[PDB]
Amino acid sequence: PPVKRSLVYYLKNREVRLQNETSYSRVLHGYAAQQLPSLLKEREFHLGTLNKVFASQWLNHRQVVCGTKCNTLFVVDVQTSQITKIPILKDCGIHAIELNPSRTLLATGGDNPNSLAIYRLPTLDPVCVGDDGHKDWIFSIAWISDTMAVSGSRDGSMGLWEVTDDVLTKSDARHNVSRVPVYAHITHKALKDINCKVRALAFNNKNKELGAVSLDGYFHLWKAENTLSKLLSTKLPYCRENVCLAYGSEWSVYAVGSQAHVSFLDPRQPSYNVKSVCSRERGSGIRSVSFYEHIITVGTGQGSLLFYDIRAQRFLEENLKLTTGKGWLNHDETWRNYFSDIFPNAVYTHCYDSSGTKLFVAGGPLPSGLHGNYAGLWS
């Protein structure tokens, strides 16, 4: 038979409890997803003088954490407009924040931009030190299981690290025998080496693969069923400025960014099914990308979010496009030298909500010589 697909059946069955079931839980969202883009409104936040927001992740319905160029790690409430600053972990600030699939651990950079750090959610207590497996930066921290994590780097090292059950136990025991922060090192169970820098990652969660990206323009898929085992590689379609890549967990396509295009890549399929949608916003660079049910949110440098529809192959709505505010700026000596004759805050990060209604954008100014925060919550 044809699919029983209509919102009215759900509406009227819901009233009787008879078959309002969860075969609809995927149409309600396919509908809300194309509805929201048209009815979002900014609400600025006042951070102060922090440099540039690089990482952001939701912790609750209300608290989102952010990491900056001045390697601050701060939790902002989205209701009360409250910034709280937390420690940092010893052994160009923060560049990537992720939460283990169980939402219990938090794997971000530390006092060393070449080491790592591990906080235990939902209480943020510091747990581990950064390890030595990377002498260069950490530019991506993906989670592959409840305790194994894979860390890209600006040298090329792809060191699998993994929080052990033993450090789990002496971490739920080290905060009882004491209350002062106590840490614990880990060894990189692997240090597999590979314009040879592991910038951005992804994670498919059925084939247990880790199709990464390297800024020279090279995709590198390294399956991790339980441990890393490199599988394949490929020169990506566009060459310049490939810094963002995500995977649509139910569309079997990788969305990867570029200078002025966005590419849909099927890995186990060859390079003649590569579609690069043009943004035409020439001069920004797609600094972030994310998947809602069938809707790709692109976050660029000129300060504007754009929306694409994987199914109708075209953009939403003249294409709907938000625009980030002004925020804050610093008037340093380099502001006087080369950046006084003119800022379009560039959205480096954006994330939706567990309840799928409120979006959170953050960023700063695009020229590297500048210094200015910005962060805004769009519902």
């Binding site: 540039k52 530019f139 810094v243 080369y338 560039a346 695009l366 020229p367 590297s368 010589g369």
Partner: peptide
């Protein structure tokens, strides 16, 4: 000018 990695 730019250079923000």
């Amino acid at each position: 000018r730019e250079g923000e990695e």
